[PDB]
Amino acid sequence: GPHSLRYFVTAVSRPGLGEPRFISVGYVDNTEFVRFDSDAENPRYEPRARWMEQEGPEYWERETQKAKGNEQSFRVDLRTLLGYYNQSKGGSHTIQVISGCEVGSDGRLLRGYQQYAYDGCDYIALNEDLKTWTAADMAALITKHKWEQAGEAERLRAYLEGTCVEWLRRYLKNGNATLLRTDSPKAHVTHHSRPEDKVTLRCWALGFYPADITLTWQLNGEELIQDMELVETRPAGDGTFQKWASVVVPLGKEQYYTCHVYHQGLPEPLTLRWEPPP
């Protein structure tokens, strides 16, 4: 299937409290594998996945130098944007970037990314054609014109189609065995009620990975979607995820409802119902 290598970078100014906080996180197939955090005496990129410990000292040195370079570049950008937006030097502002490549099974680039945000809002982004830019406001038009003249789009395309794809292959080779990890969900239904003629049936999905999953409630036929409570998928904190979906049903009719769990790791969707303990 498809794979991706993207870096999520953040710079947060802290006027009157020190230098901007700079953090760069690298992800392979949406899994963190390297991290750089300026919050240290001698900041350096660090492995966040065991399979990365394979990279030698020259790799870590090179990436660290590049991160510190980007850090100082973001420091300058923060000041630059204060000018573009005519803002005070006393407030805290944030710049974020998502940079990377998504490649298909054939090894060809499916989509390249190079998007920026200022204070949580889109600023500028490289279009799918990897040739033009989309500026979100007037301040970004300045950067756009600047990057159009500098041929920045061509520089990024070279990285996205070359270096990014190449390193992605390299990382996949070393971590493939780990990245393919799959933990099917273990489900069960709980029964809850307050002194009333209705009851809540809650369908739980636990210990699964990846996080993508679907839970549905069925009444004999048809899918109950209009009145089903659902929580956002959440980390258990040990590498697996959790999720639940609940429905309110008539007291005594619990056996008419069925919960279905859909996961990519399931040879076949799970079907279960409330089972009162012995």
Binding site: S24, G26, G69, S73, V76, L81, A150, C164
Partner: peptide
């Protein structure tokens, strides 16, 4: 491997 960013 990350890219070296340009200035805004």
């Amino acid at each position: 491997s990350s890219i070296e960013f340009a200035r805004l």
